[PDB]
């Protein structure tokens, strides 16, 4: 058991993402805001992924589990199969 990896999502890494988003200047408050949003995302996607895992009576989450999960969330992903 190991908590608070959400800080592992470093300020500079968020800066990097927002740069690829074409952001020039970033309010300090944004870095925590983003962590929260990111968490909410992973929560919603993983929940579903695991739910598919459990339905397959597996103990190992497959890429497909994630792919199928993202499709449900309307965020389809190409290049990890089906």
């Amino acid at each position: 058991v190991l908590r608070d990896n959400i800080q592992g999502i470093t300020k500079p890494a968020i800066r990097r993402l927002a740069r690829r988003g074409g952001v020039k200047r970033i309010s300090g408050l944004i870095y925590e805001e983003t962590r929260g949003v990111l968490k909410v995302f992973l929560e919603n996607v993983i929940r579903d992924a695991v739910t598919y895992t459990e339905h397959a009576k597996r103990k190992t989450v497959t890429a497909m589990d994630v792919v199928y999960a993202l499709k449900r969330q309307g965020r389809t992903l190409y290049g990890f199969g089906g």
Binding site: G22, T76, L77
Partner: protein
């Protein structure tokens, strides 16, 4: 279109980024694949005008 984007990068072989560039630059393919994420795709270069320096 990807094959074109690859010639435009002095590469023999199409890679993801090529497929993205092709799709996001063609009005109709973009619209078809509007809710699709392409692995290792990157985004189109685009810096909002007002963000560029003054002259």
């Amino acid at each position: 279109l990807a094959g074109n984007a690859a010639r435009d990068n002095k590469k023999t072989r199409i890679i993801p980024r090529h497929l993205q560039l092709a799709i996001r630059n063609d009005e109709e393919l973009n619209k078809l694949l509007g809710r699709v994420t392409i692995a290792q795709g990157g985004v189109l270069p685009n810096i909002q005008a007002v963000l560029l320096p003054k002259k």
